[PDB]
Amino acid sequence: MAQNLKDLAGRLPAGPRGMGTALKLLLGAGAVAYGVRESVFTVEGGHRAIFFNRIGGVQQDTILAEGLHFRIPWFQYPIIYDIRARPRKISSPTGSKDLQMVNISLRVLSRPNAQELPSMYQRLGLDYEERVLPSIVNEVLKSVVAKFNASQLITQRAQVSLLIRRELTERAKDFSLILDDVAITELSFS
Amino acid sequence: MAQNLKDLAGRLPAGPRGMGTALKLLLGAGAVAYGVRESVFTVEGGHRAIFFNRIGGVQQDTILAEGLHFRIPWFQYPIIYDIRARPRKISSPTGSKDLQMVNISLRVLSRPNAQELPSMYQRLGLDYEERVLPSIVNEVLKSVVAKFNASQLITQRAQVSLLIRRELTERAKDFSLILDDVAITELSFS
Amino acid sequence: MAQNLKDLAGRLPAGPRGMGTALKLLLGAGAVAYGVRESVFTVEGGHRAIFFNRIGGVQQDTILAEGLHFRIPWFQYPIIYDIRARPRKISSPTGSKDLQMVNISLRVLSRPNAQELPSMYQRLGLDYEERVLPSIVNEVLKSVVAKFNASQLITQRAQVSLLIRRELTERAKDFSLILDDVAITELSFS
Amino acid sequence: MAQNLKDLAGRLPAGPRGMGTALKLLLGAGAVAYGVRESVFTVEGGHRAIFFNRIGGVQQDTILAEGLHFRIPWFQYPIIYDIRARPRKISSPTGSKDLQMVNISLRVLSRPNAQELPSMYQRLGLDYEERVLPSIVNEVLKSVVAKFNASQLITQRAQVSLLIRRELTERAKDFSLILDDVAITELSFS
Amino acid sequence: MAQNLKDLAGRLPAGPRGMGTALKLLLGAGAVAYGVRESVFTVEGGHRAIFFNRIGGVQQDTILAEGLHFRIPWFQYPIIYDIRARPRKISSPTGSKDLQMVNISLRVLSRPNAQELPSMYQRLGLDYEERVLPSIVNEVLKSVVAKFNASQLITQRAQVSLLIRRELTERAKDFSLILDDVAITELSFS
Amino acid sequence: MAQNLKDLAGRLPAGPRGMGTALKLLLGAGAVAYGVRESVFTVEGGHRAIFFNRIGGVQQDTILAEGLHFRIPWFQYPIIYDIRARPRKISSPTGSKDLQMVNISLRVLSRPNAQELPSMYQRLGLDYEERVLPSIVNEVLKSVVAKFNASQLITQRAQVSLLIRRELTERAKDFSLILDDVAITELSFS
């Protein structure tokens, strides 16, 4: 029993001109949908999501796991890291444990294993892989060439990665959690 | 005879202003069709389809055959695997079953011919190619090399070429059922 | 005679509501042309047309000749193949008729001789050249490299082209009708 | 004194929706220009124009000179060739004039100079450079080595090219009118 | 009396639909800006401007210092040249001054020097960096081989760079204004 | 209470025809948003901002840090430097401090740290890395090779790199302030 509720129902039909303009709005949504078709926030697949807000430090290439959510909260940003083939290797000639000319080449592989990119994002350090990728590869490469010998090096370039395999596992892991294989293509000088 | 039946039909030819405004809809639909031209769900014909829901369980590297059915329901997503060349190979030099050292290496090949890729999508492993490629290859050359290869070190790539396939054929089909050829370019050190 | 004929001519000289909206159509028509500008059916560049309908059967990767026609029948699809440079060759080491080290390397060329991609499409087998490219160049080589000799290989890597040129033309045409050139760029080991 | 001329100007002050909807046309003109922004007929930069009709063969891979004209006649199509660097060369070992084995390598150069792409369009044949590149290069190379000797070619890979410079001018003359430079990088076997 | 002021007040009120339809014009202006978002005439920081009109000789391979101006005069066209990295060099041996084999390989670098690309543009001719690269290098590179000897070249590929370094400065200025560096990376045959 | 504050409420609304046309405005804003979806000023990801006004070509190869501010005023422009791999190295073989032939190679690397690109953008030079790269790498290379001898250089390509590390650190930081490592792969000639 209330006239206020029954009166509101008369406002719906009252002024049908507003309903006509409502159509023009529907056509505008179809045109705006195109601009959205090119971008989106919900992680599609084969990729992980990461969070950051305008005011603050931006993320830095990092992917965790999939989830159903949209960037429609209030202060979240869209920036995610995608995985792909990684070509990065060099032949370094150096000797400090057997005179003559010794060589030692090393390379690391990046694999999307487990999930911990949001915690490693700022903990990984400045930049992303381009920073530590070359350092961890040239660092262990310059330290092992001095410990290893040239005689055993010429015997087999794969035998050199055997001792470095234990030093690289603790290095790449100290920055983040990932599974990489230790192997290298090296040429020795004589 | 129901008279209301004629009153409803008369509404088709005699519609309200919606008939005049309906024109703006036909002209707006042509614009929305453009956004669809850039993306769709029905597989064209030279590619196979795969299924997944917003929930966890994304799929990839999968493709069965062609049919007109796709992204029709609500719990379905568009993510399919397209065929493409695959460059992945290495020469592993190891010494164990010989006098000095033998070099044995093998490459794996994956070809989605016809065996339902969705069943293998979760079984094979989401993008687990980089994992099984080296894991299986790096493991095979490690087992066969220790089996026997003293004088065979030279004839190896020639004769062992078949032996590496015998153990690789069961390993390649282990992760999934597919018809593909596998051969590697070997070089021995002596 | 007939008054209905004179009443139909009055439809032109009039300014009803359809005329005010009729213009909105001429404008949106130019916007729909954009979606078509990105894709069409009438073959344009030096490419041939092929046909297939939404069904288990399909027709992709195949071109016959040019014709003036639009995909506006009732059940035809747009999927055509294009021609372009083709880089595909490998160095394989395999010797037995003489020594245990012989490297051979042949390259294949693609030429749209005449037109027969629609009949050769389903007759070519799954995929397109990717399957017959390596399967043929690798089989004709492993089979011929076994009969030839290593001592003659160093005499002239092209001398072997004369032999494979006869067996290659037999397998190359087995899939369809095309004119290919036989030549081999290779260095042998000894 | 004509009254009809006064009735024409009297019609100006009487355009209700004509003057209103007239604006919708001006705004639509800017929209149609967008689809044209991606493609056009008036050649631009250093490119030449070519002409062909749907039911009149097809022109392509051919550029003449610049001119101010639009493809708005009645039966003309937009398809033009562009200039760009050209990398194409091979090392072939062929010995016949002598008892030893001499090598002969050669490559052809292309230049947009001169204006004869429309006349050469149908003269060049169906294919374009891919057919004349390996043909004239593989033809003269095998036809010259047979005449030239090995001891004379080994003396200087440039000396043997001095004779081909005379025949290359005649063969290259076929592909429209253009001047080519005769020079080659070759290594001989012995 | 001052009718010019009374008519200015009557021009404001253009009917009720005049101000209502004027809005459709503003909404159309924002649309025309989209097609422009993809192109523009004011050279952005990092590029030089060039001028030409639909008449004869279309400019394109040029660049003038930055300036604030738009292609809105009356007869100007938008076509400008961009600067970037450039890899261009050859490796080949040549014999002439000595019976042995003299090899020479030099590479030229492009500097972002404004100076005046349009003045020299028409004086440069089409195919600048393309034909002028080998014409200046390939000529002084393959021609100087007959001037110097091989015994002195094999001693140091950089030694001969001291002489050609003086000729490379006269040829580089002969075409447009640019600063070239004197260096030679080359291997020689004995 | 005042009549101005009360009459203002009646001036806000403009009849049903005014509020009805206001809808067309909200629709135009949806279209202008798409043009912005392709470009913007607020930097994103791990990129830094740079500032310049319409006048010439400066402030381009630079990047400081992230903050929400960009192209707000009218004399500001959007042009920023994005970090990326850098391939630049050479082997310089020259003998002067000894009798035999000694080689000396060196490379310089540049990496952004924090607050340094906006100040050095002009002093460093608009993208002058191509000039300063060889200028310093070729300078310190000829000054050190002529200073030290080949006996100590051939002993290890790393030893000579340690002495140049002090001369390069002062030259690299000279053009700007940045933290980067400089190492080169050298090869000596016997």
Side-chain angles (χ1 to χ4, degrees), chain A residues 17 21 24-25 28 32 34-35 38-39 52 54 56 58 77 79 91 93-96 101 128 130 189, chain F residues 16 23-24 26-27 30 34 37-38 43-46 66 68 83-86 111 154 156-157 185 187:
Chain A
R17 300 183 255 171
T21 50
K24 236 123 137 141
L25 292 175
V32 182
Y34 177 48
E38 297 216 51
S39 262
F52 156 67
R54 290 104 142 164
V58 62
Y77 200 58
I79 285 303
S91 217
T94 310
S96 262
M101 287 98 135
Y128 35 105
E130 200 183 292
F189 242 120
Chain F
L23 276 147
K24 234 196 286 275
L26 179 109
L27 275 168
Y34 178 41
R37 219 283 97 139
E38 295 219 37
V43 60
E44 57 155 87
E66 220 215 51
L68 186 127
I83 59 169
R84 56 155 99 196
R86 279 175 294 268
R111 284 143 174 275
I154 204 299
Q156 187 148 3
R157 297 127 218 117
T185 308
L187 185 110

Short mmCIF file of all heavy atoms in Angstrom, two decimals, chain A residues 17 21 24-25 28 32 34-35 38-39 52 54 56 58 77 79 91 93-96 101 128 130 189, chain F residues 16 23-24 26-27 30 34 37-38 43-46 66 68 83-86 111 154 156-157 185 187:
data_model
loop_
_atom_site.label_atom_id
_atom_site.label_comp_id
_atom_site.label_asym_id
_atom_site.label_seq_id
_atom_site.Cartn_x
_atom_site.Cartn_y
_atom_site.Cartn_z
N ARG A 17 10.53 9.55 -25.25
CA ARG A 17 11.59 10.08 -26.15
C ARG A 17 12.97 9.64 -25.66
O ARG A 17 13.87 9.39 -26.43
CB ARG A 17 11.46 11.61 -26.08
CG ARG A 17 10.06 12.03 -26.56
CD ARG A 17 9.96 13.55 -26.56
NE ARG A 17 9.12 13.88 -25.37
CZ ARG A 17 8.99 15.12 -24.99
NH1 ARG A 17 8.11 15.90 -25.56
NH2 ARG A 17 9.75 15.60 -24.04
N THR A 21 16.45 7.62 -27.79
CA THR A 21 17.90 7.96 -27.80
C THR A 21 18.72 6.79 -27.24
O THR A 21 19.88 6.62 -27.55
CB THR A 21 18.03 9.19 -26.90
OG1 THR A 21 17.38 8.95 -25.67
CG2 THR A 21 17.40 10.40 -27.59
N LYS A 24 20.78 4.98 -29.85
CA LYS A 24 22.06 5.60 -30.30
C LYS A 24 23.21 5.16 -29.37
O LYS A 24 24.33 5.00 -29.80
CB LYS A 24 21.84 7.11 -30.19
CG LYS A 24 22.12 7.78 -31.56
CD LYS A 24 20.88 8.57 -32.01
CE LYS A 24 21.31 9.92 -32.58
NZ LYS A 24 20.42 10.15 -33.75
N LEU A 25 22.92 4.97 -28.12
CA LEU A 25 23.97 4.54 -27.16
C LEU A 25 24.42 3.11 -27.47
O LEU A 25 25.59 2.78 -27.39
CB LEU A 25 23.31 4.61 -25.78
CG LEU A 25 23.01 6.06 -25.42
CD1 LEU A 25 22.23 6.12 -24.11
CD2 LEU A 25 24.33 6.83 -25.27
N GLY A 28 26.99 3.04 -30.10
CA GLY A 28 28.30 3.58 -29.64
C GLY A 28 29.08 2.48 -28.92
O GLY A 28 30.29 2.39 -29.02
N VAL A 32 32.97 1.24 -29.58
CA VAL A 32 33.99 1.28 -28.49
C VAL A 32 34.53 -0.13 -28.23
O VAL A 32 35.66 -0.31 -27.81
CB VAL A 32 33.25 1.80 -27.26
CG1 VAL A 32 34.22 1.92 -26.08
CG2 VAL A 32 32.66 3.19 -27.56
N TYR A 34 35.46 -2.25 -30.29
CA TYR A 34 36.61 -2.51 -31.20
C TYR A 34 37.92 -2.07 -30.53
O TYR A 34 38.89 -2.80 -30.51
CB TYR A 34 36.33 -1.67 -32.45
CG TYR A 34 37.48 -1.79 -33.42
CD1 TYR A 34 38.00 -3.06 -33.74
CD2 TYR A 34 38.04 -0.64 -34.00
CE1 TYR A 34 39.06 -3.17 -34.64
CE2 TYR A 34 39.11 -0.76 -34.90
CZ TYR A 34 39.62 -2.02 -35.22
OH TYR A 34 40.67 -2.13 -36.11
N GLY A 35 37.95 -0.89 -29.98
CA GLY A 35 39.19 -0.40 -29.31
C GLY A 35 39.59 -1.37 -28.20
O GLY A 35 40.75 -1.56 -27.91
N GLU A 38 41.43 -4.93 -29.25
CA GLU A 38 42.91 -4.97 -29.44
C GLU A 38 43.64 -5.19 -28.09
O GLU A 38 44.73 -5.73 -28.06
CB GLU A 38 43.29 -3.62 -30.09
CG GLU A 38 42.60 -3.50 -31.47
CD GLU A 38 43.51 -2.76 -32.47
OE1 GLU A 38 44.66 -3.14 -32.59
OE2 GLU A 38 43.03 -1.82 -33.09
N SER A 39 43.05 -4.78 -26.98
CA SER A 39 43.74 -4.98 -25.65
C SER A 39 42.81 -5.64 -24.61
O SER A 39 41.63 -5.81 -24.84
CB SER A 39 44.12 -3.57 -25.20
OG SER A 39 45.49 -3.33 -25.53
N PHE A 52 50.48 -3.61 -10.41
CA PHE A 52 51.23 -2.35 -10.08
C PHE A 52 50.28 -1.13 -10.24
O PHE A 52 49.33 -1.18 -10.99
CB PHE A 52 52.40 -2.30 -11.05
CG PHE A 52 52.87 -0.87 -11.22
CD1 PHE A 52 53.47 -0.20 -10.15
CD2 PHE A 52 52.71 -0.22 -12.45
CE1 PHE A 52 53.90 1.13 -10.31
CE2 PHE A 52 53.14 1.10 -12.61
CZ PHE A 52 53.73 1.78 -11.54
N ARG A 54 49.69 3.31 -10.82
CA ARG A 54 50.37 4.54 -11.38
C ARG A 54 51.41 5.08 -10.39
O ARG A 54 52.60 5.01 -10.62
CB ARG A 54 49.26 5.59 -11.60
CG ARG A 54 48.37 5.15 -12.76
CD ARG A 54 47.05 4.60 -12.22
NE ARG A 54 46.00 5.08 -13.17
CZ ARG A 54 44.82 4.53 -13.16
NH1 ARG A 54 43.96 4.85 -12.24
NH2 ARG A 54 44.50 3.66 -14.09
N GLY A 56 53.98 4.89 -7.92
CA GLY A 56 54.80 3.79 -7.32
C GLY A 56 55.81 3.29 -8.35
O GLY A 56 55.97 3.85 -9.42
N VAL A 58 56.99 0.89 -11.23
CA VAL A 58 56.35 -0.03 -12.22
C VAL A 58 56.93 -1.44 -12.09
O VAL A 58 58.04 -1.62 -11.63
CB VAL A 58 56.67 0.56 -13.59
CG1 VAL A 58 58.18 0.58 -13.81
CG2 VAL A 58 56.01 -0.29 -14.68
N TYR A 77 47.37 -1.85 -12.73
CA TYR A 77 47.94 -1.56 -14.08
C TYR A 77 48.15 -2.84 -14.89
O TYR A 77 48.34 -3.90 -14.32
CB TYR A 77 49.28 -0.91 -13.79
CG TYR A 77 49.74 -0.13 -15.00
CD1 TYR A 77 48.94 0.89 -15.52
CD2 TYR A 77 50.96 -0.43 -15.61
CE1 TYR A 77 49.36 1.62 -16.64
CE2 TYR A 77 51.39 0.29 -16.73
CZ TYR A 77 50.59 1.32 -17.24
OH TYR A 77 51.01 2.03 -18.35
N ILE A 79 50.52 -4.85 -17.09
CA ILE A 79 51.93 -5.05 -17.54
C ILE A 79 52.29 -6.50 -17.20
O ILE A 79 52.42 -6.86 -16.05
CB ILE A 79 52.80 -4.05 -16.74
CG1 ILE A 79 52.62 -2.63 -17.29
CG2 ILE A 79 54.28 -4.44 -16.84
CD1 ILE A 79 52.96 -2.59 -18.78
N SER A 91 81.56 -17.09 -27.33
CA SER A 91 82.79 -17.92 -27.20
C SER A 91 83.89 -17.05 -26.56
O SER A 91 84.38 -16.12 -27.17
CB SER A 91 83.18 -18.29 -28.64
OG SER A 91 83.68 -19.63 -28.65
N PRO A 93 87.69 -16.61 -25.00
CA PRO A 93 89.03 -17.21 -24.95
C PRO A 93 89.79 -16.69 -23.72
O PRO A 93 90.16 -15.53 -23.66
CB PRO A 93 89.68 -16.67 -26.22
CG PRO A 93 88.96 -15.39 -26.53
CD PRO A 93 87.76 -15.28 -25.62
N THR A 94 90.02 -17.53 -22.75
CA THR A 94 90.75 -17.09 -21.53
C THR A 94 91.44 -18.28 -20.86
O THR A 94 90.92 -19.38 -20.85
CB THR A 94 89.68 -16.50 -20.61
OG1 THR A 94 88.88 -15.58 -21.34
CG2 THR A 94 90.34 -15.79 -19.43
N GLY A 95 92.60 -18.07 -20.31
CA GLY A 95 93.33 -19.19 -19.64
C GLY A 95 94.11 -18.66 -18.44
O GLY A 95 94.81 -17.67 -18.53
N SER A 96 94.00 -19.32 -17.32
CA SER A 96 94.74 -18.85 -16.11
C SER A 96 95.13 -20.05 -15.23
O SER A 96 95.39 -19.90 -14.05
CB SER A 96 93.77 -17.94 -15.37
OG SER A 96 94.06 -16.58 -15.70
N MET A 101 96.75 -20.80 -24.71
CA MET A 101 95.45 -20.10 -24.90
C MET A 101 94.29 -21.04 -24.58
O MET A 101 94.03 -21.99 -25.30
CB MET A 101 95.43 -19.70 -26.37
CG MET A 101 96.40 -18.54 -26.61
SD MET A 101 97.96 -19.18 -27.26
CE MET A 101 98.18 -17.95 -28.57
N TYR A 128 65.83 -6.58 -16.13
CA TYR A 128 65.25 -7.95 -16.03
C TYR A 128 66.35 -9.00 -16.27
O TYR A 128 67.26 -9.13 -15.48
CB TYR A 128 64.13 -8.02 -17.09
CG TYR A 128 64.50 -7.21 -18.33
CD1 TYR A 128 64.90 -7.87 -19.50
CD2 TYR A 128 64.42 -5.82 -18.31
CE1 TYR A 128 65.22 -7.13 -20.64
CE2 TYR A 128 64.75 -5.07 -19.45
CZ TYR A 128 65.15 -5.73 -20.62
OH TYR A 128 65.47 -5.00 -21.74
N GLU A 130 68.39 -9.22 -19.12
CA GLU A 130 69.56 -8.55 -19.77
C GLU A 130 70.60 -8.11 -18.73
O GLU A 130 71.77 -7.99 -19.03
CB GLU A 130 68.98 -7.33 -20.48
CG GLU A 130 69.94 -6.85 -21.57
CD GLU A 130 69.39 -5.58 -22.22
OE1 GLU A 130 68.38 -5.68 -22.89
OE2 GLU A 130 69.99 -4.54 -22.04
N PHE A 189 91.47 -22.81 -27.93
CA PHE A 189 92.58 -22.29 -28.78
C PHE A 189 93.88 -23.02 -28.45
O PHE A 189 94.10 -23.44 -27.33
CB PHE A 189 92.69 -20.80 -28.42
CG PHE A 189 92.41 -19.96 -29.65
CD1 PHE A 189 91.34 -19.05 -29.64
CD2 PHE A 189 93.21 -20.09 -30.78
CE1 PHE A 189 91.08 -18.28 -30.78
CE2 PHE A 189 92.95 -19.31 -31.92
CZ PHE A 189 91.89 -18.41 -31.92
N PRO F 16 13.73 19.51 -22.91
CA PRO F 16 14.00 18.10 -23.27
C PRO F 16 14.83 18.02 -24.56
O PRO F 16 15.57 17.09 -24.77
CB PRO F 16 12.60 17.52 -23.49
CG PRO F 16 11.74 18.69 -23.84
CD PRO F 16 12.34 19.89 -23.15
N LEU F 23 23.06 13.58 -25.45
CA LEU F 23 23.42 12.13 -25.58
C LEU F 23 24.38 11.93 -26.76
O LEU F 23 25.35 11.20 -26.66
CB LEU F 23 22.09 11.42 -25.84
CG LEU F 23 21.39 11.14 -24.51
CD1 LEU F 23 19.88 11.21 -24.71
CD2 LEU F 23 21.77 9.74 -24.02
N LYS F 24 24.12 12.56 -27.87
CA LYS F 24 25.01 12.41 -29.05
C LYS F 24 26.45 12.78 -28.68
O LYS F 24 27.40 12.26 -29.23
CB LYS F 24 24.47 13.38 -30.10
CG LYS F 24 24.19 12.62 -31.42
CD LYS F 24 24.03 13.63 -32.57
CE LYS F 24 22.68 14.33 -32.44
NZ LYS F 24 21.71 13.43 -33.13
N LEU F 26 28.02 12.31 -25.65
CA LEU F 26 28.65 11.17 -24.90
C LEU F 26 29.05 10.06 -25.88
O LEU F 26 29.97 9.31 -25.63
CB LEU F 26 27.56 10.68 -23.95
CG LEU F 26 28.08 9.49 -23.13
CD1 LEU F 26 28.31 9.92 -21.68
CD2 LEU F 26 27.06 8.35 -23.17
N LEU F 27 28.36 9.95 -26.98
CA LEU F 27 28.70 8.89 -27.97
C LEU F 27 29.98 9.26 -28.73
O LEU F 27 30.81 8.41 -29.00
CB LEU F 27 27.51 8.85 -28.93
CG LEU F 27 26.42 7.94 -28.35
CD1 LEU F 27 25.13 8.11 -29.15
CD2 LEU F 27 26.88 6.48 -28.44
N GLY F 30 33.19 8.24 -27.06
CA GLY F 30 33.56 6.80 -27.15
C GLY F 30 34.43 6.57 -28.38
O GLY F 30 35.28 5.69 -28.40
N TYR F 34 39.17 5.52 -28.90
CA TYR F 34 39.91 4.50 -29.71
C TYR F 34 41.19 5.12 -30.29
O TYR F 34 42.25 4.53 -30.24
CB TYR F 34 38.95 4.10 -30.83
CG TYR F 34 39.63 3.11 -31.75
CD1 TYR F 34 40.43 2.09 -31.22
CD2 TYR F 34 39.45 3.21 -33.14
CE1 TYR F 34 41.06 1.17 -32.08
CE2 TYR F 34 40.08 2.29 -33.99
CZ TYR F 34 40.88 1.28 -33.46
OH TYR F 34 41.50 0.38 -34.31
N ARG F 37 43.64 4.95 -27.75
CA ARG F 37 44.07 3.57 -27.37
C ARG F 37 45.37 3.19 -28.09
O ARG F 37 46.16 2.42 -27.59
CB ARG F 37 42.92 2.67 -27.82
CG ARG F 37 42.70 1.57 -26.78
CD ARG F 37 43.79 0.50 -26.93
NE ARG F 37 44.81 0.85 -25.91
CZ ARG F 37 45.38 -0.09 -25.20
NH1 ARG F 37 46.41 -0.73 -25.67
NH2 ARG F 37 44.91 -0.38 -24.02
N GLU F 38 45.59 3.72 -29.27
CA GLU F 38 46.83 3.38 -30.02
C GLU F 38 48.03 4.20 -29.52
O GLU F 38 49.16 3.77 -29.60
CB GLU F 38 46.51 3.68 -31.50
CG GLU F 38 45.41 2.72 -32.00
CD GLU F 38 45.70 2.26 -33.44
OE1 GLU F 38 46.86 2.06 -33.76
OE2 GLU F 38 44.75 2.11 -34.20
N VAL F 43 54.15 7.37 -19.60
CA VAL F 43 55.02 6.20 -19.91
C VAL F 43 54.45 4.92 -19.28
O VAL F 43 53.57 4.98 -18.44
CB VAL F 43 56.39 6.54 -19.30
CG1 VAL F 43 56.25 6.74 -17.79
CG2 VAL F 43 57.37 5.39 -19.57
N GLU F 44 54.94 3.78 -19.68
CA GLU F 44 54.42 2.50 -19.11
C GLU F 44 55.54 1.47 -19.02
O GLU F 44 56.61 1.65 -19.57
CB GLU F 44 53.34 2.04 -20.09
CG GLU F 44 53.94 1.90 -21.49
CD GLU F 44 53.11 0.89 -22.30
OE1 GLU F 44 52.14 1.31 -22.91
OE2 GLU F 44 53.47 -0.27 -22.30
N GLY F 45 55.30 0.38 -18.33
CA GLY F 45 56.36 -0.67 -18.21
C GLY F 45 57.59 -0.08 -17.53
O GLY F 45 57.50 0.81 -16.71
N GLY F 46 58.76 -0.57 -17.87
CA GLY F 46 60.00 -0.03 -17.25
C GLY F 46 60.62 1.02 -18.17
O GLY F 46 61.78 0.95 -18.52
N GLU F 66 59.68 6.43 -13.61
CA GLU F 66 58.19 6.52 -13.87
C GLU F 66 57.47 7.40 -12.84
O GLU F 66 57.77 7.40 -11.66
CB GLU F 66 57.66 5.08 -13.79
CG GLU F 66 56.60 4.87 -14.88
CD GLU F 66 55.51 3.93 -14.36
OE1 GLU F 66 54.99 4.20 -13.29
OE2 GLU F 66 55.21 2.97 -15.04
N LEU F 68 53.33 9.77 -12.63
CA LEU F 68 52.15 10.03 -13.51
C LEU F 68 52.18 11.51 -13.91
O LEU F 68 51.72 12.39 -13.21
CB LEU F 68 50.90 9.71 -12.64
CG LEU F 68 49.64 9.81 -13.51
CD1 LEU F 68 48.82 8.52 -13.38
CD2 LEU F 68 48.79 10.99 -13.03
N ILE F 83 65.14 1.11 -23.62
CA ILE F 83 66.35 0.25 -23.48
C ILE F 83 66.28 -0.94 -24.44
O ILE F 83 65.21 -1.38 -24.81
CB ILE F 83 66.34 -0.22 -22.02
CG1 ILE F 83 65.05 -1.00 -21.75
CG2 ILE F 83 66.41 0.99 -21.09
CD1 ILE F 83 65.16 -1.70 -20.39
N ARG F 84 67.41 -1.46 -24.83
CA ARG F 84 67.42 -2.63 -25.77
C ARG F 84 68.84 -3.17 -25.93
O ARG F 84 69.81 -2.50 -25.61
CB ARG F 84 66.90 -2.08 -27.10
CG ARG F 84 67.76 -0.89 -27.54
CD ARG F 84 67.70 -0.75 -29.07
NE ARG F 84 66.70 0.33 -29.31
CZ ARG F 84 66.19 0.48 -30.50
NH1 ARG F 84 66.93 0.92 -31.48
NH2 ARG F 84 64.93 0.20 -30.71
N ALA F 85 68.98 -4.37 -26.42
CA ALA F 85 70.34 -4.95 -26.60
C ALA F 85 71.20 -4.04 -27.48
O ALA F 85 70.69 -3.22 -28.23
CB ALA F 85 70.11 -6.29 -27.30
N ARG F 86 72.50 -4.16 -27.39
CA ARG F 86 73.39 -3.29 -28.22
C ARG F 86 74.54 -4.10 -28.81
O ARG F 86 75.43 -4.52 -28.09
CB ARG F 86 73.92 -2.24 -27.24
CG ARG F 86 72.87 -1.14 -27.05
CD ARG F 86 73.34 -0.16 -25.98
NE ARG F 86 73.36 -0.94 -24.72
CZ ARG F 86 72.31 -0.96 -23.94
NH1 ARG F 86 71.72 0.16 -23.62
NH2 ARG F 86 71.85 -2.09 -23.49
N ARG F 111 74.56 1.99 -20.46
CA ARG F 111 73.28 1.55 -19.83
C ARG F 111 72.73 2.67 -18.93
O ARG F 111 73.47 3.32 -18.23
CB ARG F 111 73.65 0.32 -19.00
CG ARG F 111 73.85 -0.88 -19.93
CD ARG F 111 75.00 -1.74 -19.41
NE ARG F 111 75.02 -2.94 -20.28
CZ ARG F 111 74.24 -3.95 -20.01
NH1 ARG F 111 74.38 -4.61 -18.90
NH2 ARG F 111 73.31 -4.31 -20.86
N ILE F 154 99.95 -10.52 -26.16
CA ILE F 154 99.67 -11.91 -26.61
C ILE F 154 99.54 -12.85 -25.40
O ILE F 154 98.84 -13.84 -25.45
CB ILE F 154 100.86 -12.29 -27.50
CG1 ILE F 154 100.46 -13.40 -28.48
CG2 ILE F 154 102.05 -12.76 -26.64
CD1 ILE F 154 100.04 -14.66 -27.71
N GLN F 156 97.84 -12.70 -22.86
CA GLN F 156 96.40 -12.88 -22.52
C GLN F 156 95.59 -11.67 -22.97
O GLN F 156 95.86 -10.55 -22.59
CB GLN F 156 96.36 -13.01 -20.99
CG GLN F 156 94.94 -13.39 -20.55
CD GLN F 156 95.02 -14.27 -19.30
OE1 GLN F 156 96.08 -14.52 -18.77
NE2 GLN F 156 93.91 -14.75 -18.79
N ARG F 157 94.59 -11.88 -23.79
CA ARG F 157 93.76 -10.74 -24.27
C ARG F 157 93.08 -10.04 -23.09
O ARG F 157 92.61 -8.92 -23.20
CB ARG F 157 92.72 -11.36 -25.20
CG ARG F 157 93.42 -12.00 -26.41
CD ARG F 157 92.97 -13.45 -26.56
NE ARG F 157 94.19 -14.20 -26.97
CZ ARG F 157 94.67 -15.13 -26.20
NH1 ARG F 157 93.90 -16.09 -25.76
NH2 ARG F 157 95.94 -15.11 -25.86
N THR F 185 86.33 -9.14 -27.21
CA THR F 185 86.94 -10.45 -27.57
C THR F 185 88.08 -10.16 -28.55
O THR F 185 87.86 -9.72 -29.66
CB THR F 185 85.81 -11.24 -28.25
OG1 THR F 185 84.67 -11.25 -27.40
CG2 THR F 185 86.27 -12.68 -28.50
N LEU F 187 91.74 -11.04 -30.72
CA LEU F 187 92.48 -12.13 -31.39
C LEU F 187 93.79 -11.54 -31.92
O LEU F 187 93.80 -10.51 -32.57
CB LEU F 187 91.58 -12.58 -32.54
CG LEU F 187 92.20 -13.80 -33.23
CD1 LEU F 187 91.36 -15.05 -32.92
CD2 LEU F 187 92.23 -13.57 -34.74
#
